[PDB]
Structure 1
Amino acid sequence: VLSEGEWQLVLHVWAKVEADVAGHGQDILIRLFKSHPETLEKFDRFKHLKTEAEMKASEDLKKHGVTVLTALGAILKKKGHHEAELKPLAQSHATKHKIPIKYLEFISEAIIHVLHSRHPGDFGADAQGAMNKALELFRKDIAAKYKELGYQG
């Protein structure tokens, strides 16, 4: 579990992310798509984007960045009591989109990378450690729903 002190660290940087969800959302997806190109293959709707410049120019891509950060932010603010928000998410991603847990690990790393880039001041080692623990909790809880459904990993 995260301590209260750790959740405050998490939510204080997140409040900065909320100042520009679209910009953060965009960078994180692009970072994910560039680092692990196999992830882009899950999106029929983005499978035509070949360069970073095309990715950066996609308004639909931007809109998906905001969708992802918005749902994640809702989860973070529950500070661990995210059972209701997490369930519908695990179910669609497991059975519908067919996203392996590993890819969740990949987007978590993309999030951490971007935050460090846009908030070097509010994102010190202690905050990076708290953020890591929060995303690990999220993955751990999803993984468990996946396992129940016959999809573990």
Structure 2
Amino acid sequence: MVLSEGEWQLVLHVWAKVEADVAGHGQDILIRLFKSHPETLEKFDRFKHLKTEAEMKASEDLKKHGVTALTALGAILKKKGHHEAELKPLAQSHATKHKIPIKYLEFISEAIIHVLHSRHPGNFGADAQGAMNKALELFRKDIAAKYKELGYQG
């Protein structure tokens, strides 16, 4: 696919709001993913044992990870579709070290869209949500093609 510049604008405008507090958004998003789809928590050997949302909130490791993951996602979105390089090392570790199915990336995309909608309703109207979804669909589609070249899934 290909986003127009206007769509990229809508995506990078609400992302700039996220960047005002990356660690808070990363906690909200990972907790929303683990509460909605608890099977995803099992992929993390580091926090797998967390039993409640309070324990998740208080975990520093979980918060660090959230920052690591959002930061990488932000660096990809800022590329505006020219992210080949960035995607490479990311697709490799997720396909052969962590083993993250495409379905899980869909789950976190849904968690990202849920939190942005809750926190930033003014900058996340229907058109901006359609654009963000488009950008994540692109990210998934390109990672899915990379997984296949690498020998994993699809």
1:122-153 deviations in whole A, cap 9, x for unaligned?
A: 00000000000000000000000111122124
Mapped contact 1:6–1:127 kept (Cα < 8 A): yes
Alpha-carbon shift at residue 53 of structure 1 (Å): 0.5
Report the counterpart of residue 24 of structure 1 in structure 2: 25
- CA distance in 1: counterparts of 2:60 and 2:93, whole angstroms: 24
- Looking at structure 2, the residues matched to 98 and 137 of structure 1 have their Cα atoms a distance apart, in angstroms, of 20
Taking only the aligned residue pairs, the percentage that are identical comes to 99
Structure 2: state its 5+ residue gaps: none
Q: Distance in 2 between matches of 1:131 and 1:152?
A: 25
CA offsets 1:41-97 (integer angstroms, 9 cap, x no match): 000100110000100111111111100110000000000000000010000000010
Inter-partner Cα distance in structure 1 for 2:153 and 2:15: 29
Q: Distance in 1 between matches of 2:87 and 2:114?
A: 23
The correspondence of residues 1-153 of structure 1 with structure 2, limited to 5 A, is 1-153=2-154
Over residues 90-125 of structure 1, what are the superposed CA-to-partner deviations in whole Å (9 max), with x where a residue is unaligned? 000000101111100001000000000100100000
Distance 1:147 1:85 in 2: 17
Tell me how far apart the structure 2 counterparts of residues 144 and 134 of structure 1 sit (CA, whole Å): 16
On the 8 A contact 1:144/1:152 being kept in 2, the answer is: no
RMSD of aligned Cα (Å) = 0.6
Q: How far does the alpha carbon of each residue in 1:8-63 deviate from its partner, in whole angstroms, 9 at most, with x for none?
A: 00000000000000000000000011111110000010011000010011111111
**Aligned-partner Cα distance in 2 for 1:49–1:94:** 24
Q: Distance in 1 between matches of 2:151 and 2:107?
A: 21
Paired positions, count: 153
Gaps (5+ residues) in structure 1?
Answer: none
Q: Is the 8 A contact 1:7 1:130 kept in 2?
A: yes
In the TM superposition, structure 1's runs of 4+ consecutive aligned residues that sit over 3 Å from their partners are none
3-state SS, counterpart of residue 38 of structure 1: helix
